[PDB]
Amino acid sequence: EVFPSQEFVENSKLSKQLFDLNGQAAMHDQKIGNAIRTIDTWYEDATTPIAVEPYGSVVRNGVAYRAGNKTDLFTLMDGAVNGKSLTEEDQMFVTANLIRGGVFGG
Amino acid sequence: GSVVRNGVAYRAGNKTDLFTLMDGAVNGKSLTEEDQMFVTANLIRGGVFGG
Amino acid sequence: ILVPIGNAHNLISGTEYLWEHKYYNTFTQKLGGSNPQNCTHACNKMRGGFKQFNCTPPQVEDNYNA
Amino acid sequence: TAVMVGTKTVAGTQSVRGNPNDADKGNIQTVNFANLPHNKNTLLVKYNVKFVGDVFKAELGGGEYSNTLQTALENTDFGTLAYRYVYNIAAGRTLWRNRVGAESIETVI
Amino acid sequence: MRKFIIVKNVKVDGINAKSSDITVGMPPATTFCGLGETMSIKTGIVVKAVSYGSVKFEVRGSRFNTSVTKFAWQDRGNGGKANNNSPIQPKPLADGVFTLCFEVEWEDCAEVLVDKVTNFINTARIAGGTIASFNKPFVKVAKDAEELASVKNAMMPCYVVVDCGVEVNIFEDAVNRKLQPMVNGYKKLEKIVDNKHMRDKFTPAYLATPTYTMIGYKMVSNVDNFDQALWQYGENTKVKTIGGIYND
RNA sequence: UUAAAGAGUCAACCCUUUGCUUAUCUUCCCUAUUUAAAU
DNA sequence: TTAAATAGGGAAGATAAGCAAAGGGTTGACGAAAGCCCTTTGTCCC
DNA sequence: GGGACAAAGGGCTTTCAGAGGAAACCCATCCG
């Protein structure tokens, strides 16, 4: 058995619908891209790293690393431009997260 | 543990459930050998446990 | 530079006019989510979901001339 | 050879936490599946990746904050990030739970 | 109607299927006109008209209730509750393969245009999607109306969009005439005063709403006049075709 | 150019029973003839 | 290693009887706009 | 040290409201 990508679709005649392209099983591009950026090894604990995201969290596991303990994307971004520079791990994380797209505001 | 073919449902609400034993295992008292083997066997099989 | 926005009359008018004309070539979208009472007044009362036109074009069938 | 999907119907029991008096009834579900044919024993997954530059270029706003951030950055080592991104593809993390049960995984890049 | 360039069998994944609040599916002709304008401004070559044909298209999901894409926490207002299933704000996606024809006014050479187009396509987007693959572009020359049929037939096989006009409104025409609406332009409502959060402080800003027109899908070999299958910018913020309303 | 951004994931016994069947006319009719040396 | 020359007309295609019952169709996660309180930082006054 | 304002963050939260509904479409040609 092979495991193609699934979809979140409102209730229909099926209970589990798999992604396909003209009758052929395929995988979503978001799923392919998520596994590439799983390099966030630069926090305090939790070996077997996770994907780089602002407020780095794993909703599947229900836990959110890089919480309100003075290690965030926005805190480091504000601190880098306001004088004092960061350590090697902090810049390597900020640049890696900036490579990933997104809109930041609030 | 039920057999829809026979219409009877063993391991009913008489203090022998997968969820009851699994909940009690982490909350202090452990289980017996047969209960541990049942829980491990039911964990090898898949399923959803939450709600 | 333009900022596109939606029209309130079109959604309600199209939904009401098309639900009774049997046009089975449309999607269905629901706004708000788990608590749709904080978006608009139309979404709060029309909880069934607004209707959208399905603009899927015909596709070139393969293994033949066209 | 392309792999189709197909649809099947399964029957079973009702095992839901918090509902013990309804566990003696049946359950009918309709699902999709996907598996290799009985004459083939190898799954081939093919795709493409594109890497582009022009980093530190904001798409919305930024006339002094973006320039200050760019000046503060660019001293980091991109070699480690590039090594890790390529390794996540080469080692075989891009392919999910299809990984298990395989005695040999080959990657052609 | 002198120089045309053809790019056929272009694969794009992740196309934003939501063009308006009531239209989900193919991008309107405005998207392709904007792509042509972007090519003209970036490359420095004047482009007159754009034509698009749908080879394949499929909206992700089922017959109804297309799909929902999972969202992520990316704003600076959270951190405590930003650990479980951010809200939705739905945004549909689709996958399609198209074919494009561009009217070009360039006479310096014959092979440089292919290279300059291929350079731009490798880094371009179609309605937010990513281009997977495409064929090598080729150039056709038309001197009169009779040989326009040849450059038209060079686009086989695909389905081209033609304009049929609106009679009363899209809602009544769709049920009766059995056609599909499309966005052809925007109508301005009122001018933006505060220019703080806008992406440009020099370009005047406006609030606009889409204007709807009814279109049809026709085989390339069944098109009477090729001028009815080319779109370009018009007056009063609209997109119009050279041949006007299509008539058999 | 409605530009910019985003992991759907997990689990399943479809089982049991069976009489298709009775009848039948395909008949008549007919001109295939006309040659030439072995390469 | 042949030139031509045609290849049937007519009739006609059956009817009746019946197509089963019972059981079940899952759960969990995806909110904006405030009120109050506390803490910290920064500015100003006393 | 006390008073006021703003921002950031969390929590005490919590306030707010509410059952419709029915079904598989568009469309046949260039080229070696």
XYZ file of C-alpha atoms (C1' of nucleotides) in Angstrom:
697
model
C 0.000 0.000 0.000
C 1.140 3.528 -0.842
C 0.141 6.730 0.953
C -0.586 9.742 -1.274
C -1.674 13.114 0.080
C -5.117 13.581 1.603
C -7.479 16.553 1.435
C -9.746 18.404 3.843
C -13.143 18.354 2.116
C -16.636 18.870 3.521
C -18.700 15.695 4.026
C -19.449 13.824 0.793
C -20.178 10.272 -0.347
C -16.657 9.293 0.786
C -14.949 9.258 4.181
C -11.297 9.491 3.065
C -10.442 11.094 -0.280
C -6.916 11.030 -1.695
C -5.364 13.669 -3.933
C -5.058 12.747 -7.607
C -4.364 14.381 -10.975
C -6.552 12.919 -13.741
C -6.876 9.547 -12.020
C -3.223 9.250 -10.937
C -2.117 9.482 -7.310
C 0.049 12.504 -6.476
C 1.216 14.622 -3.539
C 0.593 18.268 -2.716
C 3.384 20.791 -3.195
C 2.853 22.175 0.321
C 3.554 18.719 1.768
C 6.730 18.393 -0.317
C 7.901 21.855 0.740
C 7.192 21.313 4.439
C 9.677 18.434 4.747
C 12.499 20.379 3.071
C 12.719 23.107 5.740
C 12.791 20.795 8.796
C 16.152 22.089 10.009
C 15.295 23.927 13.256
C 17.874 22.271 15.520
C 18.953 25.555 17.113
C 16.800 25.624 20.259
C 17.352 24.349 23.779
C 16.161 20.727 23.540
C 14.020 18.307 21.498
C 16.420 16.554 19.141
C 14.887 15.210 15.880
C 14.232 18.799 14.759
C 11.107 20.441 13.345
C 10.252 22.834 10.515
C 11.220 26.500 10.750
C 8.173 28.689 11.430
C 7.598 31.919 13.373
C 6.671 30.824 16.892
C 7.895 27.381 15.920
C 5.049 25.021 16.746
C 3.890 21.514 15.849
C 0.085 21.553 15.828
C -0.002 17.775 15.304
C 1.739 17.214 18.645
C -0.028 20.109 20.387
C 3.230 21.672 21.592
C 4.732 25.042 20.639
C 8.475 25.494 21.018
C 10.050 28.962 20.972
C 7.239 30.220 23.205
C 7.216 33.437 25.213
C 10.676 32.874 26.697
C 12.574 35.605 24.805
C 13.364 33.428 21.756
C 10.994 34.297 18.892
C 11.327 35.391 15.278
C 9.964 38.870 16.008
C 12.002 39.412 19.188
C 15.250 38.492 17.422
C 14.281 40.579 14.382
C 13.675 43.634 16.575
C 16.875 43.055 18.551
C 19.078 42.619 15.485
C 18.284 46.040 14.006
C 18.310 47.824 17.392
C 22.037 47.803 18.010
C 23.337 44.595 19.566
C 23.845 41.738 17.113
C 22.821 38.110 17.654
C 24.731 34.837 17.936
C 25.421 32.493 15.008
C 22.411 30.261 15.704
C 20.028 33.234 15.888
C 21.083 34.698 12.524
C 21.073 31.232 10.939
C 17.470 30.809 12.147
C 16.284 34.302 11.165
C 17.738 34.032 7.654
C 16.304 30.527 7.221
C 12.852 31.733 8.308
C 13.097 34.765 5.987
C 13.836 32.363 3.121
C 10.397 30.941 3.855
C 7.699 33.373 2.748
C 4.910 34.984 4.727
C 3.436 38.269 5.887
C 4.358 39.625 9.328
C 2.245 42.263 11.044
C 0.073 43.288 13.975
C -14.287 -6.193 22.411
C -17.438 -7.110 20.523
C -18.595 -9.528 17.836
C -21.194 -7.910 15.586
C -21.723 -11.317 13.959
C -23.019 -12.742 17.253
C -24.577 -9.465 18.421
C -22.928 -9.644 21.854
C -20.368 -7.141 23.158
C -17.795 -8.393 25.650
C -15.615 -6.007 27.672
C -18.652 -3.782 28.220
C -19.073 -1.201 30.966
C -17.898 -3.508 33.759
C -14.453 -2.032 34.515
C -12.652 -3.820 31.648
C -12.113 -1.363 28.772
C -9.110 -0.298 26.723
C -9.666 3.346 27.678
C -10.299 2.586 31.362
C -7.156 0.460 31.716
C -5.044 2.902 29.687
C -6.272 5.833 31.788
C -5.635 3.957 35.036
C -2.157 2.802 34.021
C -0.751 6.340 33.890
C -2.652 7.416 37.033
C -0.724 5.506 39.662
C -1.634 1.827 39.859
C -0.235 -0.403 37.117
C -1.863 -3.344 35.333
C -1.459 -7.124 35.379
C 0.323 -9.312 32.817
C -2.814 -10.098 30.801
C -3.927 -6.455 30.942
C -0.492 -5.261 29.791
C -0.550 -7.765 26.918
C -4.073 -6.629 25.965
C -3.076 -2.948 25.981
C 0.065 -3.644 23.938
C -1.906 -5.765 21.458
C -4.555 -3.041 21.096
C -1.815 -0.428 20.582
C -0.203 -2.526 17.835
C -3.579 -2.299 16.128
C -4.387 1.262 15.088
C -7.343 3.441 15.991
C -8.286 6.764 17.540
C -8.202 7.280 21.319
C -9.412 10.728 22.340
C -12.544 12.722 23.110
C -3.301 50.577 -7.721
C -6.625 48.971 -6.791
C -7.982 47.109 -3.762
C -10.767 44.728 -4.868
C -13.698 44.206 -2.501
C -16.868 42.149 -2.706
C -20.466 43.278 -3.129
C -23.082 42.361 -0.523
C -26.088 42.506 -2.874
C -24.668 40.014 -5.382
C -24.156 37.130 -2.935
C -27.623 37.216 -1.355
C -29.375 37.977 -4.646
C -27.622 35.184 -6.543
C -28.140 32.640 -3.774
C -31.863 33.372 -3.431
C -32.432 33.576 -7.195
C -30.451 30.435 -8.035
C -31.646 28.136 -5.239
C -35.118 28.056 -6.838
C -34.003 27.758 -10.487
C -32.219 24.380 -10.118
C -28.751 25.336 -11.395
C -26.640 22.347 -10.335
C -23.327 23.746 -11.583
C -22.215 25.689 -8.508
C -20.019 25.389 -5.424
C -20.913 26.273 -1.825
C -18.801 28.374 0.548
C -19.422 29.128 4.230
C -17.926 32.187 5.925
C -17.097 32.766 9.575
C -16.237 29.221 10.602
C -17.051 27.708 13.985
C -18.477 31.071 15.143
C -19.888 32.851 12.059
C -21.673 35.531 14.129
C -18.666 37.895 14.161
C -18.261 38.466 10.398
C -21.507 39.980 9.058
C -25.260 39.907 9.580
C -25.964 37.989 6.358
C -23.522 35.204 7.258
C -25.074 34.854 10.723
C -28.567 34.257 9.305
C -27.606 32.508 6.038
C -25.681 29.684 7.694
C -26.320 27.308 4.789
C -23.581 28.944 2.748
C -23.279 31.304 -0.199
C -23.144 29.998 -3.766
C -20.338 30.466 -6.293
C -20.249 29.794 -10.024
C -18.247 26.742 -11.114
C -16.088 28.081 -13.960
C -14.383 24.793 -14.838
C -13.734 24.801 -18.607
C -14.010 21.750 -20.861
C -10.779 19.785 -21.076
C -9.112 18.140 -24.063
C -9.786 14.407 -23.768
C -6.654 12.392 -24.538
C -6.020 9.146 -26.471
C -7.889 10.578 -29.479
C -7.807 13.482 -31.942
C -9.162 16.059 -29.478
C 3.061 2.367 -15.128
C 0.683 4.891 -13.588
C -1.005 4.112 -10.265
C -4.764 4.641 -10.054
C -6.771 5.192 -6.869
C -10.037 3.252 -6.834
C -12.687 3.135 -4.123
C -13.702 0.422 -1.657
C -16.215 -0.153 1.137
C -15.314 -1.555 4.561
C -17.305 -2.868 7.520
C -16.372 -2.939 11.175
C -17.354 -2.010 14.713
C -17.920 1.264 16.580
C -15.069 1.965 19.023
C -15.502 5.555 20.237
C -14.412 6.756 23.675
C -17.303 7.757 25.942
C -19.984 5.673 24.149
C -19.971 2.193 25.738
C -23.625 1.221 25.193
C -23.382 1.605 21.390
C -20.419 -0.739 20.847
C -22.481 -3.769 19.741
C -23.544 -2.261 16.398
C -21.840 -2.298 13.011
C -20.180 0.420 10.962
C -20.062 0.793 7.169
C -17.615 3.228 5.568
C -16.547 4.067 2.014
C -12.897 5.008 1.490
C -10.228 5.404 -1.177
C -6.958 3.488 -1.428
C -3.803 3.143 -3.516
C -1.381 0.233 -3.839
C 1.076 -1.255 -6.299
C -0.037 -3.972 -8.737
C 0.895 -7.588 -8.099
C 3.418 -7.646 -10.972
C 5.329 -4.520 -9.854
C 7.450 -4.190 -6.718
C 8.942 -0.685 -6.933
C 7.438 2.749 -6.314
C 8.918 5.662 -8.267
C 8.233 9.199 -7.032
C 9.394 12.010 -9.306
C 9.292 15.787 -8.907
C 11.227 19.028 -9.398
C 12.537 21.793 -7.118
C 13.543 25.354 -8.024
C 15.891 27.502 -5.933
C 15.900 31.262 -6.541
C 17.827 34.119 -4.963
C 17.023 37.810 -4.497
C 16.736 37.405 -0.726
C 16.267 40.480 1.521
C 13.768 42.031 -0.918
C 10.454 42.847 0.753
C 7.274 42.500 -1.286
C 5.168 44.957 0.751
C 6.690 48.040 2.347
C 10.108 48.537 3.861
C 12.365 51.477 3.083
C 14.533 51.647 6.196
C 13.615 48.606 8.315
C 14.359 46.216 5.440
C 17.681 47.906 4.627
C 18.739 47.847 8.289
C 17.816 44.157 8.526
C 19.765 43.409 5.335
C 22.828 45.248 6.664
C 22.600 43.428 10.007
C 22.289 40.113 8.142
C 24.344 38.705 5.194
C 27.174 37.873 7.639
C 25.619 34.471 8.378
C 26.828 31.212 6.830
C 24.522 30.093 4.020
C 26.613 26.948 3.541
C 24.995 25.107 6.447
C 21.471 26.047 5.330
C 22.211 24.928 1.767
C 23.740 21.679 3.046
C 20.709 20.908 5.227
C 18.160 21.758 2.515
C 19.874 19.439 0.027
C 20.360 16.724 2.668
C 16.642 16.708 3.499
C 16.074 15.718 -0.139
C 19.042 13.369 -0.597
C 18.591 11.369 2.621
C 14.925 10.841 1.777
C 12.889 12.947 4.185
C 10.830 14.541 1.401
C 8.896 11.275 1.050
C 6.564 10.553 3.980
C 5.212 7.351 5.562
C 5.859 5.491 2.301
C 9.382 5.275 3.788
C 8.580 2.451 6.220
C 8.661 -1.128 4.978
C 11.347 -0.443 2.352
C 14.640 -2.340 2.463
C 16.364 -0.114 -0.124
C 15.782 3.537 -1.055
C 17.602 5.031 -4.049
C 17.650 8.740 -4.903
C 18.594 10.106 -8.332
C 19.168 13.865 -8.471
C -1.384 41.141 -36.534
C 2.240 40.759 -37.650
C 4.331 38.753 -35.158
C 3.019 36.091 -32.785
C 4.864 33.885 -30.284
C 3.419 30.568 -29.085
C 4.116 28.772 -25.798
C 2.105 25.559 -25.517
C 1.718 22.873 -22.842
C 2.669 24.952 -19.800
C 2.158 23.125 -16.494
C 1.249 25.275 -13.477
C 0.503 23.921 -9.996
C -1.251 25.732 -7.166
C -3.252 28.247 -9.208
C -5.453 30.531 -7.102
C -8.872 29.379 -8.312
C -10.699 32.217 -6.500
C -10.976 35.131 -8.929
C -13.909 36.832 -7.160
C -16.557 36.183 -4.512
C -18.772 34.284 -6.989
C -16.299 32.989 -9.613
C -14.110 29.975 -8.796
C -12.083 28.312 -11.535
C -10.220 29.728 -14.515
C -8.425 33.044 -13.979
C -10.051 35.899 -15.910
C -8.465 37.527 -18.948
C -7.289 40.308 -16.618
C -4.710 37.927 -15.122
C -3.202 37.126 -18.523
C -3.301 40.783 -19.587
C -1.406 41.656 -16.403
C 1.092 38.872 -17.084
C 1.656 40.313 -20.558
C 2.077 43.821 -19.150
C 4.582 42.484 -16.607
C 6.511 40.772 -19.404
C 6.508 44.015 -21.403
C 7.741 46.183 -18.521
C 10.379 43.713 -17.289
C 11.710 42.631 -20.702
C 11.363 45.932 -22.569
C 9.344 44.542 -25.486
C 5.944 45.960 -26.421
C 3.203 43.311 -26.268
C -0.115 44.053 -27.975
C -2.559 41.242 -27.163
C -2.671 37.992 -25.198
C -4.611 34.801 -25.931
C -5.026 31.877 -23.541
C -6.375 28.381 -24.025
C -7.225 25.746 -21.435
C -5.690 22.339 -22.150
C -6.414 20.878 -18.705
C -7.955 22.245 -15.522
C -9.162 20.764 -12.238
C -10.195 22.386 -8.962
C -8.859 20.446 -5.980
C -11.483 18.423 -4.135
C -14.922 17.160 -5.133
C -17.973 18.199 -7.159
C -19.050 20.588 -4.379
C -17.179 22.021 -1.377
C -13.861 22.325 -3.175
C -11.145 22.375 -0.501
C -9.597 24.161 2.474
C -5.892 24.918 2.883
C -4.373 24.735 6.357
C -3.115 28.036 7.763
C -0.241 28.909 10.088
C 0.593 31.482 12.750
C 2.550 34.292 11.095
C 1.466 37.564 12.764
C 2.938 39.475 15.709
C -0.020 39.435 18.079
C 0.154 35.922 19.501
C 2.526 33.507 21.214
C 0.434 32.083 24.030
C -2.529 30.633 22.146
C -0.535 30.201 18.906
C -0.205 26.448 19.337
C -3.378 24.837 17.923
C -5.070 25.162 14.541
C -5.140 28.825 13.502
C -8.374 29.968 11.785
C -9.151 29.215 8.166
C -9.874 32.269 5.979
C -10.609 30.002 3.004
C -8.572 30.165 -0.208
C -9.203 27.564 -2.944
C -6.497 26.115 -5.177
C -6.527 24.320 -8.522
C -4.185 22.731 -11.060
C -4.149 23.394 -14.789
C -2.208 23.237 -18.041
C -2.607 26.130 -20.483
C -1.343 27.462 -23.813
C -0.452 31.104 -24.475
C -0.178 33.275 -27.581
C 1.464 36.702 -27.424
C 1.266 39.442 -30.053
C 4.739 40.982 -30.253
C 6.057 44.014 -32.136
C 9.749 43.244 -32.606
C 11.831 43.081 -35.780
C 15.468 43.188 -34.605
C 16.004 39.436 -35.065
C 14.197 36.085 -34.950
C 15.955 33.944 -32.320
C 16.711 36.521 -29.607
C 12.998 36.793 -28.768
C 12.807 33.076 -27.942
C 15.695 33.385 -25.472
C 14.357 36.579 -23.871
C 10.914 34.996 -23.452
C 12.359 31.772 -22.020
C 14.369 33.836 -19.527
C 11.210 35.565 -18.229
C 9.019 32.438 -18.163
C 11.496 30.531 -15.972
C 10.930 33.141 -13.230
C 7.266 34.064 -13.792
C 3.953 33.095 -12.180
C 0.396 32.462 -13.368
C -2.189 33.630 -10.803
C 0.252 32.780 -8.017
C 1.077 29.290 -9.275
C 4.485 27.815 -10.042
C 5.386 26.875 -13.614
C 6.530 23.253 -13.835
C 7.429 22.841 -17.516
C 6.789 24.359 -20.932
C 7.711 23.831 -24.567
C 10.199 25.848 -26.589
C 8.581 29.047 -27.926
C 8.276 29.611 -31.659
C 7.412 32.678 -33.726
C 4.833 32.957 -36.511
C 4.562 35.784 -39.045
C 1.238 37.059 -40.410
C 1.037 39.517 -43.311
C -2.719 39.464 -44.005
C -6.035 38.134 -42.677
C -6.076 34.903 -44.721
C -2.893 33.512 -43.148
C -4.114 34.444 -39.659
C -5.928 31.099 -39.819
C -2.541 29.346 -39.910
C -1.204 31.062 -36.776
C -4.578 30.385 -35.149
C -4.350 26.674 -36.040
C -0.782 26.616 -34.681
C -2.309 26.703 -31.167
C -3.918 23.253 -31.422
C -5.083 21.669 -29.244
C -6.823 23.919 -26.688
C -10.085 25.699 -25.846
C -10.147 29.485 -26.275
C -12.376 32.002 -24.460
C -14.610 34.208 -26.612
C -16.809 37.116 -25.544
C -20.587 37.004 -25.991
C -21.657 40.040 -23.952
C -24.279 40.461 -21.247
C -27.999 40.854 -21.942
C -29.516 41.754 -18.556
C -27.191 40.361 -15.880
C -25.031 37.296 -15.316
C -27.489 35.587 -12.940
C -30.418 35.511 -15.385
C -28.245 34.963 -18.473
C -26.439 31.952 -16.965
C -29.712 30.107 -16.337
C -31.252 31.038 -19.695
C -28.384 31.400 -22.178
C -26.272 28.716 -20.420
C -22.945 30.579 -20.357
C -20.399 31.327 -17.633
C -19.555 34.792 -16.243
C -16.099 36.342 -16.203
C -14.400 39.471 -14.872
C -13.417 41.988 -17.553
C -12.593 45.088 -15.505
C -12.962 47.047 -12.299
C -15.176 49.992 -11.359
C -13.783 52.656 -9.033
C -15.818 53.630 -5.961
C -13.866 56.170 -3.883
C -10.298 57.435 -3.583
C -7.868 56.335 -0.877
C -6.849 59.268 1.320
C -4.357 57.778 3.795
C -1.315 56.547 1.854
C 0.563 54.932 4.745
C -0.014 51.180 4.353
C -0.139 51.168 0.545
C 2.613 49.465 -1.442
C 3.327 52.679 -3.386
C 3.163 56.331 -2.320
C 3.240 57.768 -5.859
C 0.558 55.790 -7.676
C -2.999 57.014 -6.957
C -5.072 54.440 -5.078
C -8.724 53.490 -5.540
C -11.372 51.117 -4.234
C -12.730 48.981 -7.065
C -15.271 46.213 -7.607
C -15.258 43.662 -10.446
C -17.535 44.003 -13.462
C -18.972 40.807 -14.893
C -19.396 39.707 -18.496
C -20.466 36.376 -19.969
C -18.025 34.290 -22.012
C -17.910 31.023 -23.916
C -15.406 28.270 -24.627
C -14.737 27.343 -28.252
C -12.431 24.979 -30.102
C -9.581 26.708 -31.920
C -10.440 25.196 -35.316
C -14.033 26.462 -34.954
C -13.155 30.150 -34.481
C -14.430 32.315 -37.333
C -12.314 35.444 -36.762
C -9.066 35.241 -34.801
C -9.404 38.891 -33.734
C -12.235 37.829 -31.397
C -9.842 35.606 -29.399
C -7.305 38.311 -28.451
C -7.725 40.487 -25.352
C -6.212 43.853 -24.466
C -6.705 46.749 -22.076
C -9.573 49.084 -22.895
C -11.194 52.317 -21.742
C -12.660 53.038 -18.298
C -10.579 50.263 -16.675
C -11.839 47.366 -18.801
C -10.418 44.536 -20.897
C -11.896 44.040 -24.349
C -11.319 41.912 -27.423
C -10.367 43.200 -30.866
C -13.254 41.496 -32.663
C -15.968 42.623 -30.263
C -18.969 40.433 -29.517
C -18.495 36.989 -31.038
C -21.126 35.997 -33.605
C -21.350 32.758 -35.577
C -0.966 41.201 -10.859
C -7.991 39.492 -5.772
C -0.036 40.631 -6.030
C 2.808 38.618 -1.214
C 2.068 33.462 2.764
C 0.271 27.992 4.742
C 1.370 19.351 6.487
C -5.202 16.639 6.879
C -3.900 12.890 9.485
C -5.175 7.933 12.143
C -8.665 2.775 12.479
C -12.101 -1.530 10.063
C -15.071 -9.577 8.231
C -20.451 -8.332 4.142
C -22.231 -12.523 5.156
C -26.537 -16.967 4.547
C -30.576 -19.812 0.956
C -32.265 -21.566 -4.730
C -35.293 -26.697 -10.736
C -36.004 -22.588 -16.193
C -39.263 -25.324 -19.531
C -42.709 -27.387 -22.932
C -43.743 -27.687 -29.099
C -41.749 -27.548 -34.644
C -41.160 -29.720 -42.810
C -37.006 -25.084 -45.679
C -38.562 -25.848 -49.919
C -38.664 -25.507 -55.457
C -34.463 -23.956 -61.031
C -29.886 -23.583 -63.953
C -24.888 -24.577 -70.871
C -18.965 -21.779 -68.099
C -16.992 -21.529 -73.065
C -13.093 -19.183 -76.602
C -7.474 -19.891 -78.574
C -1.795 -20.467 -78.071
C 5.093 -23.824 -80.641
C 9.823 -25.024 -74.289
C 13.740 -20.498 -73.539
C 1.613 -16.391 -66.280
C -5.254 -13.423 -70.604
C -8.638 -10.405 -72.525
C -14.811 -10.141 -70.958
C -19.299 -11.565 -67.928
C -22.931 -12.242 -64.636
C -23.676 -13.803 -58.830
C -32.422 -15.013 -57.944
C -36.867 -13.812 -57.026
C -41.264 -15.301 -52.906
C -42.997 -16.447 -47.614
C -42.136 -15.993 -41.666
C -39.588 -15.332 -37.101
C -44.519 -18.069 -30.585
C -46.820 -17.816 -26.133
C -47.404 -18.108 -20.526
C -45.325 -17.548 -14.981
C -42.028 -15.194 -11.351
C -37.004 -11.235 -9.706
C -36.490 -12.323 -1.369
C -35.980 -10.928 3.525
C -32.749 -8.903 7.931
C -28.663 -5.677 10.344
C -25.410 -1.428 10.686
C -23.417 4.155 7.971
C -18.068 7.163 14.044
C -15.448 10.168 16.415
C -11.172 14.809 17.643
C -8.770 19.833 15.954
C -9.330 24.805 13.039
C -13.105 32.734 17.033
C -13.154 38.221 16.783
C -13.343 42.035 19.852
C -13.287 43.557 23.569
C -13.745 44.283 29.454
C -10.612 43.882 33.651
C -6.086 42.904 36.221
C -0.895 42.304 36.659
C 4.089 42.849 34.991
C 7.851 45.170 32.062
C 9.801 49.125 29.051
C 9.708 54.352 27.776
C 8.090 59.585 28.195
C 6.133 63.689 31.493
C 4.701 65.840 36.262
C 4.928 65.897 41.732
C 8.261 56.435 45.829
C 3.067 58.181 43.835
C -0.187 59.803 39.329
C -1.242 59.681 33.778
C -0.467 57.660 28.592
C 1.098 54.115 25.005
C 2.927 49.469 23.485
C 3.937 44.316 24.283
C 2.364 39.714 26.748
C -0.505 36.574 29.521
C -4.363 35.265 32.300
C -9.322 36.151 35.313
C -11.755 35.270 30.696
C -16.416 36.022 28.287
C -19.466 38.166 25.789
C -21.965 36.971 21.384
C -25.428 33.702 18.823
C -28.122 29.222 16.656
C -31.266 23.256 12.335
C -31.354 24.223 6.169
C -31.991 20.072 2.743
C -31.649 17.733 -1.413
C -29.474 14.819 -8.038
C -23.441 12.415 -13.140
C -22.062 18.145 -19.062
C -19.870 19.439 -23.509
C -18.795 17.986 -27.854
C -15.479 15.006 -34.026
C -8.750 17.201 -37.884
C -3.373 17.956 -39.819
C 0.616 16.099 -41.398
C 4.408 13.268 -42.811
